[PDB]
Amino acid sequence: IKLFSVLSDQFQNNPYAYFSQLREEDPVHYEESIDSYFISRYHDVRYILQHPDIFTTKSLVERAEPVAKRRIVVRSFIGDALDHLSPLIKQNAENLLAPYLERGKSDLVNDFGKTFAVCVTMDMLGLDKRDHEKISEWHSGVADFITSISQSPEARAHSLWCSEQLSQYLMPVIKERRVNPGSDLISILCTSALSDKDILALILNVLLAATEPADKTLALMIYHLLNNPEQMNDVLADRSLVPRAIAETLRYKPPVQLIPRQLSQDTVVGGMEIKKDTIVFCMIGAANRDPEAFEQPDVFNIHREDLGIKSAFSGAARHLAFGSGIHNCVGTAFAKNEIEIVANIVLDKMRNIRLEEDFCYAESGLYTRGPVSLLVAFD
Ligand code: HEM
Ligand SMILES: c1ccc(-c2ncc[nH]2)cc1
Numbered sequence: 001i002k003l004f005s006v007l008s009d010q011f012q013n014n015p016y017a018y019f020s021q022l023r024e025e026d027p028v029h030y031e032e033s034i035d036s037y038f039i040s041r042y043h044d045v046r047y048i049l050q051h052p053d054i055f056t057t058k059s060l061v062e063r064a065e066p067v068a069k070r071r072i073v074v075r076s077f078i079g080d081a082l083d084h085l086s087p088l089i090k091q092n093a094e095n096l097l098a099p100y101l102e103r104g105k106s107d108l109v110n111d112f113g114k115t116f117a118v119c120v121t122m123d124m125l126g127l128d129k130r131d132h133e134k135i136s137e138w139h140s141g142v143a144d145f146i147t148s149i150s151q152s153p154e155a156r157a158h159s160l161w162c163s164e165q166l167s168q169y170l171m172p173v174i175k176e177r178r179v180n181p182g183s184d185l186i187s188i189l190c191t192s193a194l195s196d197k198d199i200l201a202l203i204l205n206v207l208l209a210a211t212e213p214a215d216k217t218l219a220l221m222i223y224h225l226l227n228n229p230e231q232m233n234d235v236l237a238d239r240s241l242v243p244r245a246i247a248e249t250l251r252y253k254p255p256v257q258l259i260p261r262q263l264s265q266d267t268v269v270g271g272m273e274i275k276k277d278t279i280v281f282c283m284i285g286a287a288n289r290d291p292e293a294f295e296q297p298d299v300f301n302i303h304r305e306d307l308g309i310k311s312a313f314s315g316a317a318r319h320l321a322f323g324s325g326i327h328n329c330v331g332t333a334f335a336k337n338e339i340e341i342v343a344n345i346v347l348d349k350m351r352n353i354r355l356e357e358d359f360c361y362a363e364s365g366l367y368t369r370g371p372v373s374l375l376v377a378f379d
């Protein structure tokens with residue numbers, strides 16, 4: 001059945017049950033609802049993410065809207081700085097965890113994760129960490145505008161308010177640093193090219209970008225490590241394993257699930273010929289589960305020889321969770337080091353971590369996916 005819908009409740013309840021069938025039967029799957037093709041095969045996807053002259057993306061300055069080489073520049077402003085934020089990402093985790101020790105339990109997504117990911121992004125932007133609640137809130141409100149297929153008139157209103165709220169918060173902070181630079185990212189954005197309203201739309205995009213996926217990765221890892229208790233023990237003993245666990249969780253259950261692209265000319269991918277101006281969706285989950293790229297692909301295995309940690313976190317990595325080529329996630333380097341730091345602390349701090357009694361595990365999200373909650377218990 002090619003008639004099946006990939007925006008359907010049924011798809012969303014468990015996408016990994018259906019990818020297999022999309023590849024090998026309807027790889028360039030047309031969705032009759034939007035005017036968009038969903039591409040599910042690894043090589044078909046990777047070629048698209050390789051060449052953004054044919055499959056153009058949306059640039060790193062314009063608004064993340066209703067859904068050239070500052071990359072270089074931003075890349076090193078993360079890269080050079082990620083070793084200055086190492087003690088702060090470190091304190092963030094420790095500070096945020098302290099409430100939940102002794103109680104002996106926590107929900108790593110609701111009690112801990114969302115709030116941690118936000119505080120990191122805030123140190124990277126140099127905003128005042130006291131305001132983390134305001135921000136997580138507004139940050140979701142816009143995240144929604146983007147993630148959602150459609151919205152209620154209440155939500156759409158609320159999302160618009162959040163952007164309004166976000167703008168009027170950041171913008172004075174932009175001018176303050178344009179004239180008195182700090183040593184944060186916003187501070188650098190205003191040094192040696194860019195205008196005020198442009199620097200805002202960039203900050204807004206980095207905020208959206210560094211925040212949501214970080215959350216989800218740490219949680220997906222903890223969950224897949226506790227679900228293979230013997231691999232969890234593997235990580236507990238030799239900590240150098242953390243990155244592979246990060247990586248394999250990335251291939252396994254990629255936080256960002258779809259990558260879109262606009263189509264320049266008329267071009268063929270797979271068996272199907274497409275047409276101009278059309279948005280096609282890369283199905284990352286589907287690609288990281290293609291036998292063609294990974295053997296035993298539906299097995300969480302941190303020790304898999306076909307992962308390749310040497311490059312799991314670069315422009316030319318095996319999995320497509322960070323995208324591919326010259327448009328790969330700008331903070332890949334940063335993503336590694338951030339998640340690494342928490343994971344390590346979590347393990348250090350929640351001795352004898354286990355899943356809570358009667359913990360029923362569930363995931364949510366079409367564009368970006370992750371656990372609704374992860375209920376863990378500890379000493
Ligand atoms: C859990 C780790 C992360 C994952 C899996 C991830 C994944 C991705 C993916 C798949 C893309 C789209 C590639 C494309 O279509 O061009 C992307 C874009 C991007 N990422 Fe990440 N990312 C992560 C963490 C981060 C962090 C920590 C930062 C900032 C330090 C960051 C900054 C960006 C930026 C600026 C973009 C460009 C998209 C835009 O224009 O808004 N990412 N990321
Ligand atoms: C909502 C939140 C974040 C994203 C995103 N796109 C690339 C990296 N992160 C997309 C939608």
Ligand SMILES: [Mg+2]
Pocket residue numbers: 116117118120121210211214215338
């Ligand atoms: Mg973060």
